[PDB]
Amino acid sequence: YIPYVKTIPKKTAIVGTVCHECQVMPSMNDPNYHKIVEQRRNIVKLNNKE
């Protein structure tokens, strides 16, 4: 065996287990809809550099 390994102890704990994986998507039938689309379209339109 090896007499030294140089570990780094820490206080760790398991705080839950994943059971369902979800993907949030805004509903297309909301009055505020189509505002995010404009926001998303503005991402490419932006030109940060000068």
Partner 1 sequence: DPNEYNEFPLRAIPKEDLENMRTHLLKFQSKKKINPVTD
Partner 2 sequence: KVYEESLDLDLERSNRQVWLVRLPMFLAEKWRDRNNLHGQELGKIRINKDGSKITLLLNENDNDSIPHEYDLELTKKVVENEYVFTEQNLKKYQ
Q: Which does 39 bind (CB under 5 to 8 A by kind): partner 1, partner 2, none?
A: partner 2
Please give the backbone phi and psi of residue 9, each rounded to the nearest 5 degrees, phi first. -65, 150
Q: Which does 33 bind (CB under 5 to 8 A by kind): partner 2, partner 1, none?
A: partner 2
| Binding to partner 2 in span 7-36, by CB under 8 A | 9-27, 29-30, 32-33, 35-36
Sorted by sequence, the CB contacts under 8 Å of residue 27 that are 6+ apart come out as: 33
Per CB under 8 A, does 46 bind partner 2? no
Task: Report the distance separating Cα 37 and Cα 28, nearest Å.
Answer: 11
